[PDB]
Paper text:
Olfactomedins (OLFs), modular proteins containing an OLF domain that are predominantly expressed in neural tissues, are involved in fundamental processes of cell growth, cell signaling and cell adhesion. High-resolution crystal structures of the ∼30 kDa five-bladed β-propeller OLF domain are available for four subfamily members: olfactomedin-1, latrophilin, myocilin and gliomedin. While the folds are nearly indistinguishable [Fig. 1(a)], one difference is the presence or absence of a heptacoordinate calcium ion bound in the central internal solvent-filled cavity of the β-propeller [Fig. 1(b)].
Asp–Glu–Ser is the second-ranked triad in Arthropoda. In the case of myoc-OLFN428E/D478S the conversion of Asn428 to Glu decreases the stability compared with the previously characterized myoc-OLFD478S, reverting to the value for myoc-OLFWT. 3(a) and 3(c)]. Given the strong (for myoc-OLFN428E/D478S) and marginal (myoc-OLFN428D/D478H) stabilization by Ca2+ seen by DSF, we considered assigning either of these difference peaks as a Ca2+, but were ultimately unable to confirm calcium in either variant. To support the absence of Ca2+ in the structure, we employed a strategy used recently to identify Ca2+ ions by anomalous scattering. In sum, unlike myoc-OLFWT, neither myoc-OLFN428D/D478H nor myoc-OLFN428E/D478S copurifies with a fully occupied Ca2+, but both the Nematoda triad Asp–Asp–His and the Arthropoda triad Asp–Glu–Ser appear to be able to support metal-ion binding, perhaps in certain bio­logical contexts.
Numbering used by the authors: 245 to 290, 293 to 470, 472 to 503
Write the structure that this text describes.
């Protein structure tokens, strides 16, 4: 682990064929858990988002033929969901509740109202929408990024116990959530993306959970169609940026 020092140029990943009509944001598990593997893919059905497609083999994923279709027990608020350690973690629609849905048993194993978190457009990033609550995974596990009335719109982040969703540790930054386009976590440091609509953007803030200090940064971050979501995969050590149909990757290097 270490501080982020380099971000590569965006590299396009080959998009799966859209013939079967399933082209929502997809994700993999950075802690693959039997019966799944590092190659298992999940795709959120992009309405009242209620379906998640599961593809055991990349061959099936690229053909658009899921190995399993999960009907979620509640609707999703956002695409800021993550798969980690065998569970889908997502925000219930029109709520501040995070839900742990164990994928192979199709069982809700935990629910947690994030205390005081704004939802449904109260604390978005810089470009509106319902991005108030943002789940993230890094080398240490599961996190949630949000804000509260108490924090006055500043980014708040909490480390989540992946079994029962307890908030094991919480930090209040001094970074206004609305002042940045999105945030992600690498090795316990929160980073923010300055903008998705400026071609020559930056990673422009870093908040270190080991020190409680936020700093400005100017690491070049190139936007080459606008990305609508970004997610760090700590198993692959890359950022995955989604544009509503295609996925691009950004290689990263740390001060390891």
């Amino acid at each position: 682990c270490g501080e982020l020092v380099w971000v590569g140029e965006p590299l396009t990943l080959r998009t799966a064929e859209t013939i079967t009509g399933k082209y929502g944001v997809w994700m993999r598990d950075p802690k693959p858990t039997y019966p799944y593997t590092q190659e298992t893919t999940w795709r959120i059905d992009t309405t009242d988002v209620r379906q998640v497609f599961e593809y055991d083999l990349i061959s099936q994923f690229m053909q658009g033929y899921p190995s399993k279709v999960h009907i979620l027990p509640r609707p999703l608020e956002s695409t800021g969901a993550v798969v980690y350690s065998g569970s889908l973690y997502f925000q219930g629609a029109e709520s501040r509740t995070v839900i742990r849905y164990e994928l192979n048993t199709e069982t809700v194993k935990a629910e947690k109202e994030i205390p005081g978190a704004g939802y449904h457009g109260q604390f978005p990033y810089s470009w509106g929408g319902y991005t108030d609550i943002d789940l993230a995974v890094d080398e240490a596990g599961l996190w949630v990024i949000y804000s509260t009335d108490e924090a006055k719109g500043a980014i708040v982040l909490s480390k989540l116990n992946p079994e029962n969703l307890e908030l094991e540790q919480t930090w209040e930054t001094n970074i206004r959530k609305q002042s940045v386009a999105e945030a992600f976590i690498i090795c316990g440091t929160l980073y923010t993306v300055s903008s998705y609509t400026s071609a020559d953007a930056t990673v422009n803030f870093a908040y270190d959970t080991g020190t409680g200090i936020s700093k400005t940064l100017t690491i070049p971050f190139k936007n080459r169609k606008y990305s609508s979501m970004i997610s760090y995969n700590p198993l692959e050590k890359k950022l995955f940026a989604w544009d509503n149909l295609n996925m691009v990757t950004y290689d990263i290097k740390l001060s390891k």
